[PDB]
Amino acid sequence: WINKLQKEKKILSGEKEFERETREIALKELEKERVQKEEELQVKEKLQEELRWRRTFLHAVDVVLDPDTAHPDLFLSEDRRSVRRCPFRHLGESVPDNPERFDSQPCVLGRESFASGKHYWEVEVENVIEWTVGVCRDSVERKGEVLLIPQNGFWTLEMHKGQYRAVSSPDRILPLKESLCRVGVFLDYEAGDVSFYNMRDRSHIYTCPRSAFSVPVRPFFRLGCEDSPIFICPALTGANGVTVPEEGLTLHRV
Amino acid sequence: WINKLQKEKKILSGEKEFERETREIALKELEKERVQKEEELQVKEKLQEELRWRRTFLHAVDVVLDPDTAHPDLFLSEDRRSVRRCPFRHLGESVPDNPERFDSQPCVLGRESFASGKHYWEVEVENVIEWTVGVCRDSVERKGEVLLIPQNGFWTLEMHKGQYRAVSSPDRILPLKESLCRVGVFLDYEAGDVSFYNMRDRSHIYTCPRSAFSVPVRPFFRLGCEDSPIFICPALTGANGVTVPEEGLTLHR
Amino acid sequence: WSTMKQEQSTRVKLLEELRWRSIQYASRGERHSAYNEWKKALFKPADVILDPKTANPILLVSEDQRSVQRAKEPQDLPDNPERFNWHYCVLGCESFISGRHYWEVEVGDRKEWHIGVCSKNVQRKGWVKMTPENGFWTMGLTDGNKYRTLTEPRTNLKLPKTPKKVGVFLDYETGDISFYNAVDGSHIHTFLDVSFSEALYPVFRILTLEPTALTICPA
Amino acid sequence: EQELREMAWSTMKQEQSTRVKLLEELRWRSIQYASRGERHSAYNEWKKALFKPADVILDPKTANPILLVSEDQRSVQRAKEPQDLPDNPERFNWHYCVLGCESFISGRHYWEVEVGDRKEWHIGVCSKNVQRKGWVKMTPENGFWTMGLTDGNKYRTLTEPRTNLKLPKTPKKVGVFLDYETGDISFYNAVDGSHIHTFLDVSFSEALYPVFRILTLEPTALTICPA
Ligand SMILES: C[C@H](CO)CCOP(=O)(O)OP(=O)(O)O
């Protein structure tokens, strides 16, 4: 009886040691994962701090326009930052019946959609006589002629018959003493702010009355019966995409 | 003996249960740690994606200066957004100077420090005879007089005795038609880009040779005139802070 | 004790003997002819497959990993330490650590390109100067018709011809890299004496948009 | 126990396989290094390093009776008439050539010979089993590899038939460089470091001797300067 039972005792001691040795690996793994989670928490906190230092900043948008929403009377340049008019240019031509098309008024929408934060852009309209610029809700009617008013989801500044104008409420004559060349549109989603500025001196022109958007807003441009194109000033790209010499780069032009 | 061996079996068979519960409390901690780590990872890459989306943006910086870090000869507007050099307003006055103040260079540093992203600030320097504007590292010399050069950490555009010049090596005078009304300083940290722009038309004027900063960069201005207004153009403030009547706030000053 | 001692001393002496042979053996004439007499025997061909994952988001690479071309607008593709985020650079898939290899780039009639090799541990996040000090041993054409080598400072190169094709030869043991005019077999440039550290990678960059891309000839 | 002999039997094959591939690779390196060529400082850079400076002393015992080996045993002059002296098999009888007392069995060696403003000379490397009696054409097949000046301002390499070496300069000091293993005899202008001619892939079997021959009566002696 003794012999086989002490075989069994030795066998049991055989697996007791392996069971003991299987503990340190698990504990070491748990501690190393504690270290990993501490490191990832540090990285996450740094990311959160950097994104807190994020969008409290005014964002100068590099506006690119959308050809699919451009009116058939309108024509876009090769760089998609210039729009002009040309009557009877798409009469019966191959144009798809896109539901997002402006086919009532001569207008075109920016490709960018804004949902929060402060963002502004600049437009060159010195060469035209009838320009409308501003902000629109993404759900504005497109098929039929609409009214460019905040009631319909439009916050715009207008030129009509050589006179500056508000949201097209004709009771808000703008007594601007000098003719405009560059106009700045400013948007603030949190406070419902739609401001217009004279970009020569960066002075106030008109703030539309605050109205909560709750819809992704989008820049909206409209060119009257003036063949002169409208230029949206590109953002300050810098020396990006160019070879910089050692004596500096002077007077870049493209 | 036989009795010793049976008690040995009894005791040493009494060690399995403790090993079982240790195994269990190890495995359960392992699994819920895995799932919690997975949730943390998921939200972390969500933040990564959002930041990658919100890192290709140009930011109009509202530069505000620090009147401690200016030459005592200088004078600063109370709004802290425009400066000049008065004819020694502290003649007979004692101004203890902190260790981080310039002493022989009449300069002022923008208090905001950038470490990434694309930024730019405008300066209105109408009617001045000596102005230098640009970017300096946070670790430039203060105790003494140095030279404003890219080596020392000074990317500057200068107007000296009526000539427009680059980083202040007198061998690179630019072909500029007329004086500068408004000059924009543009900065790209991940590309070493320090550009000077003609803000009358938003036209390229100069690009500094590329030089990795690896330290936060801050705006830097120096003046040589006496009472010649230079204006840091504030970022578009919108109509925040002012009540808008339903008639519509128009032509605000 | 003599096993590694031989592999140290004899190979070092052979390397220095070949370096000294370089000076006295080029002291002869410039009989640069039969470009295929040495480019296939001394150096073995390498078929360079491009890696359409380490490329900048701005670059389009054909499905065959021959051509890299600057696309119209930057893309938004998933990023990682493999992807260059600023430099308009693309790397081949394979790395070289020993032996000697070569590859031919058909630059066509472009106006701006840069080709060469780079270290395994290159800084792919941000802007880092492309110099031998960092690990980018490259050269090529800029400013339309100006040929340059990316040194510190960058060096203009006077060429009597226009290289439509460029052959890059790497020899890890000697540690010397050469760019030849594969059109006529002439010698364009050669970085000498270079002591490598880790595996090397083909690199291509183009800071412009043209109808013709950077084609890579097979092995 | 053949293991001790086995180590030698193994090293003999590995050594026979080493040098053949090394030499072929070196020749391909030669054909590749042909481009990217210049010599501004090369001559004084590697002629003192890679080529084991060797001194050559003139041997009167092989000189023709017409040649007067100078007392310093390094220079050779041209006399008027052949003085009588014994005709050993070493001694030449028709060709006007003199050699050195030492033959370079293997390795890389070099020696500088100044010709000055001479108008006729021929220096080179000859074999040991050459025909010293009678006239034999000094070709590579006959064991002679020689560079020569002729009729004032003509330069030739003594192949068959004679080939003309057009050169822009006029050498005064010529360095001769012999590489047994690579099988290369090279003539260089020691004053400036240019290149004149190199004999490529010469099958060497025997020892090699310097050879100098002068035809015309001239007041200038061919001097061999040592290391
Ligand atoms: C856009 C190109 C390719 O990425 C980068 C230009 O970087 P530089 O340093 O200005 O060019 P180079 O080093 O060739 O002078």
CA distance C109 to C89: 20
Two tokens at D1?
């126990």
Cβ of residue A47 closer than 8 Å to a chain B Cβ: yes
Atom 6 (ligand 1): residue with closest C-alpha? Answer: A243
Amino acid code (one letter) for A65: L
Q: Strand C166-171 vs strand C155-156: parallel, antiparallel, or unpaired? A: unpaired
Provide CB contacts within 8 A for A179, sequence distance 6+: A126
For residue A68, the domain's CATH number is 2.60.120.920
User: Is A158 contained in some domain?
Assistant: yes
User: Is B242 contained in some domain?
Assistant: no
CA distance A110 to A121: 11
For chain A, the chains sharing at least 3 beta-carbon pairs closer than 8 angstroms are B, C
D132 close to D89: Cβ distance less than 8 angstroms: yes
User: Is B28 contained in some domain?
Assistant: yes
Cβ of residue C24 closer than 8 Å to a chain D Cβ: yes
| Distance (Å) from CA A239 to ligand 1 centroid | 10
Interchain CB distance below 8 Å, A241 and C143: no
Co-location of B223 and B168 in the same domain: yes
CA atoms within 13 A on the CB side of B251: 9
Backbone gaps in chain D, preceding residues (C–N over 2.5 A): none
Co-location of B161 and B223 in the same domain: yes
Of the candidates A242, A243, A246, the beta carbon closest to that of C153 is on A246
CA triplet D32, C92, C190: central angle to 5 degrees?
30
CA distance B249 to C68: 54
Chain A residues closer than 8 Å to B2 by CB: 1-2
Amino acid code (one letter) for A12: L
For residue A2, give how far its alpha carbon lies from the nearest alpha carbon of chain B (Å).
Answer: 7
> B15, B35, B53 — which closes off a domain?
B53
Two tokens at A139?
């759900």
Q: How far apart are the first and last CA of chain A?
A: 100
- Alpha carbon distances (Å) from A236 to A60, A109, A239, B60, B251: 9, 22, 9, 11, 28
Interchain CB distance below 8 Å, B12 and A13: yes
Co-location of B42 and B95 in the same domain: no
User: Is B245 contained in some domain?
Assistant: no
Interchain CB distance below 8 Å, A243 and C142: yes
CA distance B117 to B187: 8
CA distance A90 to A73: 7
Cβ of residue A242 closer than 8 Å to a chain C Cβ: yes
Co-location of B39 and B97 in the same domain: no
User: Is A201 contained in some domain?
Assistant: yes
Two tokens at D168?
């822009």
Co-location of B132 and B65 in the same domain: yes
3-state secondary structure string across chain B: CHHHHHHHHHHHHHHHHHHHHHHHHHHHHHHHHHHHHHHHHHHHHHHHHHHHHCCCCEEECCCCECCCCCCCCEEECCCCCEEEECCCCCCCCCCCCCCCCCCCCCEEEECCCECCCEEEEEEECCCCCCEEEEEEECCCCCCCCCCCCCCCCEEEEEEECCEEECCCCCCCECCCCCCCCEEEEEEEHHHCEEEEEECCCCEEEEECCCCCCCCCEEEEEEECCCCCCEEECCCCCCCCCCCCCCCCCECCC
Co-location of B8 and B129 in the same domain: no
Chain D residues closer than 8 Å to C37 by CB: 31
Q: Whose structure tokens read 């307003």?
A: B89
- Domain span at residue A185 reads 59-232
CA triplet D52, D55, D61: central angle to 5 degrees?
140
Pocket lining for ligand 1, CB < 6 angstroms: A 241, 243-244; B 210; C 87-88, 130, 142, 150, 154, 205, 207
User: Is B241 contained in some domain?
Assistant: no
Mutate to test the interface with D, among C28, C31, C161, C183 (most CBs of D within 10 A): C28
**Resolution for this experimental structure (Å):** 3.5
Interchain CB distance below 8 Å, A60 and B59: yes
Two tokens at A178?
């000098």
Closest CA to D69 of D222, D225, D226, D227: D222
**Cβ-based contacts under 8 A for chains A and C:** 10
Interchain CB distance below 8 Å, C143 and A242: no
Q: Whose structure tokens read 């100077």?
A: B97
User: Is A129 contained in some domain?
Assistant: yes
CA triplet A231, A236, A240: central angle to 5 degrees?
115
Cβ of residue B55 closer than 8 Å to a chain C Cβ: no
Co-location of B129 and B225 in the same domain: yes
Interchain CB distance below 8 Å, A243 and C112: yes
Looking at chain C, which runs of residues are DSSP E strands?
44-45, 59-61, 68-70, 89-91, 100-106, 113-119, 137-142, 146-149, 155-156, 166-171, 176-181, 186-191, 200-205, 215-216
Sketch out chain C's domains with CATH numbers: 36-216 (2.60.120.920)
Co-location of A23 and A92 in the same domain: no
Co-location of B67 and B6 in the same domain: no
Chain C residues closer than 8 Å to D28 by CB: 38, 41-42
- Alpha carbon distances (Å) from A228 to A83, A84, A111, A121: 9, 6, 22, 20
Give how many domains chain A has, as a whole number: 2
Co-location of A146 and A48 in the same domain: no
Q: Strand C146-149 vs strand C155-156: parallel, antiparallel, or unpaired? A: antiparallel
Cβ of residue C173 closer than 8 Å to a chain A Cβ: no
C206 close to A241: Cβ distance less than 8 angstroms: no
Rounded to 10 degrees, the C-alpha dihedral B198/B201/B202/B203 comes to -60
Count other C-beta atoms under 10 Å from residue A15's C-beta. 11
Cβ of residue A28 closer than 8 Å to a chain B Cβ: no
Closest CA to C152 of C138, C128, C139, C133: C133
How many residues can be counted in chain A?
Answer: 254
Interchain CB distance below 8 Å, C25 and D33: yes
Rounded to 10 degrees, the C-alpha dihedral A15/A17/A19/A22 comes to -140
Co-location of B63 and B141 in the same domain: yes
Cβ of residue A249 closer than 8 Å to a chain C Cβ: no
CA distance C149 to C151: 6
Burial code of B204-220, b = ≥16 C-beta within 10 A, e = fewer? Answer: bbbbbbbbebeeebbbb
User: Is B250 contained in some domain?
Assistant: no
CA distance A30 to B29: 8
Co-location of A4 and A78 in the same domain: no
Experimental approach: cryo-EM
D220 close to D120: Cβ distance less than 8 angstroms: no
Pocket test for ligand 1, best of C69, C87, C133, C134 (most atoms within 8 A of CB): C87
Interchain CB distance below 8 Å, A204 and B251: yes
Q: Write phi, then psi, for A69 (nearest 5 degrees).
A: -95, 5
